[PDB]
Amino acid sequence: RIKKISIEGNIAAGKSTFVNILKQLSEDWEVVPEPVARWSNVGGNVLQMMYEKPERWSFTFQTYACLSRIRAQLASLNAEKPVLFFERSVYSDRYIFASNLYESESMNETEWTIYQDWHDWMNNQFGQSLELDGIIYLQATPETCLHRIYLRGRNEEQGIPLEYLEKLHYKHESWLLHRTLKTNFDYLQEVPILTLDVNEDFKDKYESLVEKVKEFLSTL
């Protein structure tokens, strides 16, 4: 049993940074990066198409994003205590991003219906293989994430308003901290969650965070 751990967090919270750190630490730990390059060049920049015109492209983006993530995660499944760290999960795709888009009217009722039906189906076929043993929540304020967006400077992301990040933050908080967000996957209510404050730059100040992860993994 490879233990499967999803790293969750708002845009530019520091997931890639954290996971690039973690993978360098044990031969028994592997990561699966979010398929961002694939979305940027399917130009066929569907990430950019969605940000530029979300009401036209959100549904299209959601379908490709989730599929590309599932493919990567399944592929990674093929050591002493192996751990697989996923950058986000099929659940954040649906219950954080897709849901917010529906709520903001970037997906209509039909698009949202078709999407949930698709996502339901995909998971009945592969829920079992990608069932998470734990979640690491990298928690950062919307303001922190907005600044880290500016820092990173992806051209597609520079139009993003603080209000968008807030909406996504509230979803993370409701799902992972308050545990009030209801999903269709009941086991997620009881999955162990490690919450890490990453408002401070941790690139060279990560010993405490890494200590917390090891302790958490040993309880699983």
Ligand X SMILES: O=c1ccn([C@@H]2O[C@H](COP(=O)(O)OP(=O)(O)O)[C@@H](O)[C@H]2O)c(=O)[nH]1
Ligand Y SMILES: Nc1nc(Cl)nc2c1ncn2[C@H]1C[C@H](O)[C@@H](CO)O1
Q: Which does 152 bind (CB under 5 to 8 A by kind): ligand X, ligand Y, its own copies, none?
A: ligand X
Binding mask 114-133 for its own copies (x = CB under 8 A): x-xxx--x---xx-------
Structural tokens at position 33: 């990066």
Q: Is 11 in the site for ligand Y (CB under 6 A)?
A: yes
Interatomic CA distance for residues 120 and 117, integer angstroms: 5
Any binding-site annotation on 12? Answer: yes
Largest CA distance in the chain: 48
Rounded to whole angstroms, the Cα distance separating 165 from 104 reads 13
Q: Under the criterion CB under 6 A, does residue 202 sit at the interface with ligand X?
A: yes
Element housing 146 (H / E): helix 142-152
The reply, when asked if residue 179 is annotated as ligand binding, is no
Applying CB under 6 A, does 111 fall inside the site for ligand Y?
A: no
Angstrom distances, CA of residue 94 to CA of 99, 168, 189: 6, 12, 16
Outline where DSSP puts E strands in 24-173: 29-32, 83-87, 134-139
Q: Would you say 13 is a known binding-site residue?
A: yes
Residue of the chain from 69, 148, 167, 171 that contacts ligand X (CB under 6 A)? 148
Q: Determine whether the annotation assigns residue 143 to a binding site.
A: no
**Residue 43 touches which of ligand Y, its own copies, ligand X, none (CB < 5 to 8 A by kind)?**
its own copies
Instruction: Compute the residue count for the chain.
Output: 220
55 versus 197: smaller Cβ distance to its own copies: 55
Q: Which one is catalytic: 8, 27, 30, 87?
A: 87
Q: Is 87 a catalytic residue?
A: yes
Is residue 9 within 8 Å of 2, Cβ to Cβ? no
Binding mask 24-53 for its own copies (x = CB under 8 A): ------------------xxx-x--x----
Q: Residue 184 corresponds to which tokens in the numbers above?
A: 């269709």
- Annotated catalytic sites, by residue? 87
